[PDB]
C-alpha cells in the first residue's frame, strides 16, 4: 500500500530470528504469505540475449505511394540447437516497422529477450504461435515442429489490404494477421537467440524461392533502392565493430511513406506573359538543332521524310517546317518548361543585348546532303557558362518533372520494381526524384542544363529564388561509479564521420532529455563547427574532419578543460588555451559524448596506451593520465535510450503540479493535475501522458461474468474510476482509457487513429475461418467524440471507465451517460488507468477513485488487502506517472557476434550466430518489464530494496529451516547463483548478498552441523588410524 521500502523489510524480518533463536512460526508465515504471492518483491532470472536482423528493404502504403503493396520472402533453417545453455533458442520471423519497433538488446517487456512478436509494432511466427504484444497464440499447422532444422518457411504480406500470411514447409498456416495500422515502412525481420543458423531467401537474384509466391506477391529483392545495395544489418543498433575496436554509432536517418510519395508543384495554373511566347520558339529552334545533333551522333543520317528510325529528318529545314502534330509537340513542352520556371520562382524574359548576334550558330557537322537539317549549334555554353545556383535550379526542375510524371503514373496505377515489367506497370524509376541513382538524375538533368545554356546565350534575366527530436540524438556517458573529483585525465574521441559530434566532460546528474551544453551540467565541445558549450554556443577552435581525434584533457587542480585536435591544442577566439575555466569541484565529472543522426565515433577512454594515439603528442609529459587505464575490465557506459517510459511525477517539475486530497465528502479521493505556470513566459505545453502506477489484472479465466446491496457489492466483479475535466479544458484534447505496459507513443499531436490495434484470425486450413481475436496496446477514446458538442465549455465531464475482471467487457460513461463503445480483452491483461491531456487551463485533470452503482472501487482492485473494503482509498503507492521521452540505459559489456554473408545466386544470404551470451534480468512485477541486474549500479533505491530482499531471503531460511530453503530455491535457482557468483560487474551489496544467500540456503545447516562436531576427536582403531605420525617421513 505505501510502496517499496527497506525499513518495512527490516520490520518484517526482525521476526526472522531473535537473539540467535529461530522462530519457525513467523518464518513459515512470512514465507507462505510473501513468496507465493509475488507482486511486491522483485524477481531475478537468467536469460540469453537475442538479436534481430533485417534486410534493407522498406515497403509501405500511403495515399498515392509509388510502392507496391504485396511482397514475399522466405527463411530456411540450416541448424538450431534447442535448449542451448539451459534456455530454448527463441526464433521468430515476421514483419516489423521502422518507426516504433526498436529492439534494444537487454531488458524490455516481459522477461526480456524481446523478439519479433514482443510488441505491437511487429508480428511473427515461431512455428507454433503468432507472437504479438509479448503473447503467444497457438495455431494448427500440418507440421508443428517450431522451426526444426532443414525447414523452409515462407511469409507474405499485403499492404493494399492489410494481411500477413505464413506458409510453413509450403503448407500455409491457419492464422492470418489483419487490421493493423499501415504507418511507416514494413521490413522482414528475424529475431533469434544464439546458436542458430538461418538463410534469408529473397528470390530472383539474391537467393531463389524454394516455393513460388502466391499470385500477387512480388519478390523483395526487386524492392532494393537504386543507390542501396542489399545488406543485412542490425535493426536499431548503437554499437558496431571497426578497425580500432568497438565503435559507438548514433541514430540513423530512416525513411517513411512521406518521402516515398511525390508531391510536385502544379504548373498548369501559371499565367503566360509575353516572354512566354518570346522564348517558347527560340528554345524550340535550338531544340531542333539538338535533334539534328542527336541523329548525327547516333547511327541515323539525313533525310527529308518524317521517320528518324530510317535515317530521315522530318523537318528537312533548319527552321522546323513541322505540321500541326510536331509543332504543337515542341510548343507545349517548351511552354511547360517556362511554366515550371515561373511556378518555382525563376524570372522570365530574355534580354540578350546583342548576345544573339554574338551567338555563332556555326557548329554544323555539314553531313547533310540536301536542304535537310542544316541546324548548327550556337556554342551556348562556350559563350555563357552555368552557375552553381542555376545547376541546383536544374536539379529541382528535373525533380519537379520527375514528380509530375510519377504522379500521373501513380494515378493510373504503377508500382516500383527493379525489373521494369511494362505489362505490370512496374518500373524502377517512378519513385520520387530523391531516390533514383545518379544515372537517371544526370540523364534527366543534362538536357535541362543544355536548355539553361540556351537561355544564357539568349541573355535570360532568370534569377534564382513540443518535439525536441530526442530520437536523432544519443548521449553516451561513462558509469557514475567512475567519477573523478581530483586528478588530471585524458580520453580520446576518434571521428569516423563528420556530423554533429559533441565530446567533453559532464556532471553525473545530467538530464537525458536536454542536449549537451544547453544545461550547466555539461562542459562539452561540438566539433562539427568547433564551438564549445557550457551554457550556450561559443565559437572556438576549428571544425574537424573524418579521421580526427580529439584529446579532451581535464585538470581539476587548475579547474579547467583543454581540447586538442590531432595532437594540436585547439585555440579560442580570444587566444586562450583552456576552453573552460573557474570550474567548481562539484560532484565530479564523467566522459560524455553526443552523436547526431548517422554519426560514428570511437570513444577511447584510454584503457590501452598503445591504442591511445597522440597521447604522447599531448598528455604524456603534460602530466595528464589516460582515463580508466589501470582498470582491468572495460568501462561500462550508459546510452540515452529513446524508448519513452512512464516515470513517477517529479515534485521538482516547474511546470506540472499534482495535489492529492483524501477523506473528501461527497467526492471520492482525488489527485488533481494542474499547470503551475499556465499562460506565462517560457511555459511548455505539450501532450501529457498520465498513468496510475498500480496495475489491474483480470482473473485467470472468464468462467462467470446508489446505496447498493452489500452482498451484491461483495459479489460484483467490475470496477470504475472517473476523470473529471475542468472548466477551460477542451474535451477534444482529453483521452480516457486503459494502457498496457507496452505503451511507448509520445507524439504530441496525438490522434486516436495513431493507436495500434491488430487482430489475429485462426480458422480452417481449407478456408473456413472461425476464431478471431483483436488486441491493442491502448484503450482510450476521443473526448471530442464523446462530448459531441460541435466555444468555451464550462461543463465538467466525468468521463469514467468500467472494467470487469470477467468477460473483459470494458464500457465507459461520460457525464452520467452510458457509452456506445466497448472493448474486449483476454484474461490477464494487466492494464493501467490513464488519461491524456493538452493543457489549456490552470486546472487540467482530476483523477477520482471511488465507487458507484454496483461498483467496487479501483483501489480495492489494485490492492489485494482491501478487496472486500468498498471505501475508496488513496495509499501513497498509487500515483500519477508521466511519460518521459528518453532515459538512461546500460550497454552490456559483451554483445552477440553475428556472421552474415551471401553464398550464391541460389543459396543467398545466410545468418549465423554461435557464441551464447547470458544476462541476469531483474523483473519489476507491476510494470511487467525487466532491466539488467547490473543497471542497479546507479539505481540506488532499487539496489537498497534488492539488497534488503536478499537479507529477507537469507534470514527466513536462516538457522536450519530447510523447508523454507527449498521454497527459496524456486525463487533463486542454482545456475542463477553460479552466474551471480562468477560475474564481476555485479554491485557490492548484491554480490555480498548473493554469496551469503547461496551459503545460507545450501550450506548453512551442514556447516553448522559439522562445526558442532569439530570440537571432539573421537578416533577409532583402523589401519588408517595407525598411519598418522606426528612428523611425516621427509
Amino acid at each position, epitope marked *: 500500500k505505501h510502496g517499496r521500502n527497506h525499513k518495512v523489510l527490516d520490520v518484517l524480518c526482525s521476526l526472522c530470528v531473535c537473539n540467535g533463536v529461530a522462530v519457525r512460526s513467523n518464518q513459515d508465515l512470512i514465507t507462505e504469505n510473501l513468496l507465493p504471492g509475488r507482486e511486491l518483491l522483485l524477481q531475478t532470472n537468467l536469460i540469453n540475449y537475442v538479436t534481430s536482423i533485417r534486410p534493407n528493404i522498406f515497403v509501405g502504403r500511403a495515399e498515392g505511394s509509388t510502392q507496391y503493396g504485396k511482397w514475399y520472402f522466405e527463411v530456411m533453417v540450416d541448424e538450431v540447437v534447442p535448449f542451448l545453455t539451459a534456455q530454448a533458442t527463441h526464433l521468430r520471423v515476421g514483419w516489423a516497422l521502422t518507426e516504433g519497433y526498436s529492439p534494444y538488446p537487454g531488458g524490455g517487456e516481459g522477461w526480456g529477450g524481446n523478439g519479433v512478436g514482443d510488441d505491437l509494432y511487429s508480428y511473427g511466427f515461431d512455428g507454433l504461435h503468432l507472437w504479438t504484444g509479448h503473447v503467444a497464440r497457438p495455431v494448427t499447422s500440418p507440421g508443428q515442429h517450431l522451426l526444426a532444422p532443414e525447414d523452409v518457411v515462407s511469409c507474405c504480406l499485403d499492404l493494399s489490404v492489410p494481411s500477413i500470411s505464413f506458409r510453413i514447409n509450403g503448407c500455409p498456416v491457419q492464422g492470418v494477421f489483419e487490421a493493423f495500422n499501415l504507418d511507416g515502412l514494413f521490413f522482414p525481420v528475424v529475431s533469434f537467440s544464439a546458436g542458430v543458423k538461418v538463410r534469408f531467401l529473397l528470390g530472383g537474384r539474391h537467393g531463389e524461392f524454394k516455393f513460388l509466391p502466391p499470385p500477387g506477391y512480388a519478390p523483395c529483392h526487386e524492392a532494393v533502392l537504386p543507390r542501396e545495395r542489399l545488406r543485412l544489418e542490425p535493426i536499431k543498433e548503437y554499437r558496431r565493430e571497426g578497425p580500432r575496436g568497438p565503435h559507438l554509432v548514433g541514430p540513423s536517418r530512416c525513411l517513411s511513406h512521406t518521402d516515398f510519395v511525390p508531391c510536385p508543384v502544379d504548373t498548369v495554373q501559371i499565367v503566360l506573359p509575353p516572354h512566354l511566347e518570346r522564348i517558347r520558339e527560340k528554345l524550340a529552334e535550338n531544340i531542333h538543332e539538338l535533334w539534328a545533333l542527336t541523329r548525327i551522333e547516333q547511327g541515323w543520317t539525313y533525310g527529308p521524310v518524317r521517320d528518324d528510325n530510317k535515317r530521315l529528318h522530318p523537318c528537312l529545314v533548319n527552321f522546323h517546317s513541322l505540321p500541326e*502534330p510536331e509543332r504543337n509537340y515542341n510548343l507545349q513542352m517548351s511552354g511547360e518548361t517556362l511554366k515550371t520556371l515561373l511556378a518555382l520562382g525563376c524570372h522570365v524574359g530574355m534580354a540578350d543585348e546583342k548576345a544573339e548576334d554574338n551567338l555563332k550558330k556555326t557548329k554544323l557537322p555539314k553531313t547533310y546532303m540536301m536542304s535537310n537539317g542544316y541546324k548548327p549549334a550556337p556554342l551556348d555554353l562556350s559563350h555563357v557558362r552555368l552557375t552553381p545556383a542555376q545547376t541546383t535550379l536544374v536539379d529541382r526542375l528535373a525533380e519537379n518533372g520527375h514528380n509530375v510524371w510519377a504522379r500521373d503514373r501513380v494515378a493510373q496505377g504503377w508500382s516500383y520494381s527493379a525489373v521494369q515489367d511494362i505489362p505490370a506497370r512496374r518500373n524502377p524509376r517512378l519513385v520520387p526524384y530523391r531516390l533514383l541513382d545518379e544515372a537517371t538524375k544526370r540523364s534527366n538533368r543534362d538536357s535541362l542544363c543544355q536548355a539553361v545554356r540556351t537561355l544564357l546565350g539568349y541573355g535570360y534575366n532568370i534569377e534564382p529564388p513540443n518535439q525536441s527530436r530526442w530520437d536523432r540524438v544519443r548521449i553516451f556517458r561513462a558509469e557514475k561509479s567512475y567519477t573523478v573529483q581530483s586528478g588530471r585525465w585524458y580520453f580520446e574521441f576518434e571521428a569516423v564521420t563528420t556530423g554533429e559530434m559533441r565530446v567533453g566532460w559532464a556532471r553525473p546528474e545530467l538530464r537525458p532529455d536536454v542536449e549537451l551544453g544547453a544545461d550547466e551540467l555539461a562542459y562539452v565541445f561540438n566539433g562539427h563547427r568547433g564551438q564549445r558549450w557550457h551554457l550556450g554556443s561559443e565559437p572556438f577552435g576549428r571544425p574537424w574532419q573524418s579521421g580526427d581525434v580529439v584529446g579532451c584533457m581535464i585538470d581539476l587542480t587548475e579547474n579547467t578543460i583543454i581540447f586538442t585536435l590531432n595532437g594540436e591544442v585547439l585555440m579560442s577566439d580570444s587566444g586562450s588555451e583552456t576552453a573552460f575555466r573557474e570550474i567548481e569541484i562539484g560532484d565530479g565529472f564523467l566522459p560524455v559524448c553526443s552523436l547526431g543522426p548517422g554519426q560514428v565515433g570511437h570513444l577511447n577512454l584510454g584503457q590501452d596506451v598503445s591504442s591511445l594515439r597522440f597521447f604522447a603528442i599531448c598528455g604524456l609529459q603534460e602530466g595528464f593520465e589516460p582515463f580508466a587505464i589501470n582498470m582491468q575490465r572495460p568501462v561500462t557506459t550508459w546510452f540515452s535510450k529513446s524508448l519513452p517510459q512512464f516515470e513517477p511525477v517529479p515534485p521538482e517539475h516547474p511546470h506540472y503540479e499534482v495535489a492529492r486530497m483524501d477523506g473528501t465528502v461527497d467526492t471520492p479521493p482525488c489527485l488533481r493535475l494542474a499547470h503551475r505556470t499556465w499562460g506565462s513566459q517560457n511555459s511548455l505545453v505539450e501532450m501529457l501522458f498520465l498513468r496510475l502506477s498500480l496495475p489491474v489484472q483480470f482473473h485467470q479465466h472468464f468462467r462467470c461474468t446508489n446505496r447498493d446491496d452489500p452482498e451484491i457489492i461483495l459479489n460484483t466483479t467490475t470496477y470504475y474510476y472517473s476523470v473529471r475535466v475542468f472548466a477551460g479544458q477542451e474535451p477534444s484534447c482529453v483521452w480516457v482509457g486503459w494502457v498496457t505496459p507496452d505503451y511507448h507513443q509520445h507524439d504530441m499531436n496525438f490522434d486516436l487513429s495513431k493507436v495500434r490495434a491488430v487482430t489475429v484470425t485462426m480458422g480452417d486450413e481449407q478456408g473456413n475461418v472461425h476464431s478471431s481475436l483483436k488486441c491493442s496496446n491502448c484503450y482510450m477514446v476521443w473526448g471530442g467524440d464523446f462530448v459531441s458538442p460541435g466555444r468555451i465549455s464550462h461543463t465538467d465531464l466525468v468521463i469514467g471507465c468500467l472494467v470487469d475482471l470477467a468477460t473483459g467487457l470494458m464500457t465507459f460513461t461520460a457525464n452520467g451517460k452510458e457509452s456506445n463503445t466497448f472493448f474486449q480483452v483476454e484474461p490477464n491483461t494487466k492494464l493501467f488507468p490513464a488519461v491524456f491531456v493538452l493543457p489549456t487551463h490552470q486546472n487540467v485533470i482530476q483523477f477520482e477513485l471511488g465507487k458507484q452503482k454496483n461498483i467496487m472501487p479501483l483501489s480495492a482492485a489494485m490492492f489485494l488487502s482491501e478487496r472486500k473494503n468498498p471505501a475508496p482509498q488513496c495509499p501513497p503507492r498509487l500515483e500519477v506517472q508521466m511519460l518521459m521521452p528518453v532515459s538512461w540505459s546500460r550497454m552490456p559489456n559483451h554483445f552477440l557476434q553475428v556472421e552474415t554473408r551471401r553464398a550464391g545466386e541460389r543459396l543467398g544470404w545466410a545468418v549465423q550466430c554461435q557464441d551464447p551470451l547470458t544476462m541476469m534480468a531483474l523483473h519489476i512485477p507491476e510494470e511487467n518489464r525487466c532491466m539488467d541486474i547490473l543497471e542497479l549500479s546507479e539505481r540506488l533505491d532499487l539496489q537498497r530494496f534488492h539488497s534488503h530482499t536478499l537479507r529477507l531471503y537469507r534470514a527466513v531460511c536462516a538457522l536450519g529451516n530447510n523447508r523454507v530453503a527449498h521454497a527459496l530455491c524456486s525463487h533463486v535457482d542454482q545456475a542463477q547463483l553460479l552466474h551471480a557468483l562468477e560475474d564481476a560487474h555485479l554491485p557490492g551489496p548484491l554480490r555480498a548478498g548473493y554469496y551469503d544467500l547461496l551459503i545460507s540456503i545450501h550450506l548453512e545447516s551442514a556447516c553448522r552441523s559439522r562445526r558442532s562436531m569439530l570440537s571432539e576427536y573421537i578416533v577409532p582403531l583402523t589401519p588408517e588410524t595407525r598411519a598418522i605420525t606426528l612428523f611425516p617421513p621427509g
Partner: nanobody
Amino acid sequence: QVQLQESGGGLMQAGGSLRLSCTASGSIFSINSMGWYRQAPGKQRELVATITSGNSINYADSVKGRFTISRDNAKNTVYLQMNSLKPEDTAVYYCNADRVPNGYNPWGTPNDEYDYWGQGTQVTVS
C-alpha cells in the same frame, strides 16, 4: 489518369477484315500521337501503327501489314483497318496515348516516359 478504352477486332478467320476502333476520351493531354502496340504469342510489345495528329501513320515495325490506321483529333478515337491476319496475328492488341510523335524525340527519356497504355483485347486468327 488518361484511361482510354482499348477494343476492336476479335475472333476471326485468316485474312479477316477487322476494324480495331480503340476509343479515347476524357483526356486533354497526350493528344499528339496515338500508338498501337501488340503482344504476339511469347513476344514483347511490338508497335504496329502510331497515328499522329493530322492522321499521320507511322511506319517503324510491320509496315507490310495493311494496318491503315486513322484518327480524328475531334474525338481522339482511333480506328485501325487491319485485314491481313497472319498466324502470328493470333495475339493481343493494345492502344497507348502520348504527346511525343514516334520517330521524333529531341528532349530526352521523360518525354518518352509520358505515355498511357491500354486495356488489351484479343484478335484471334483461325
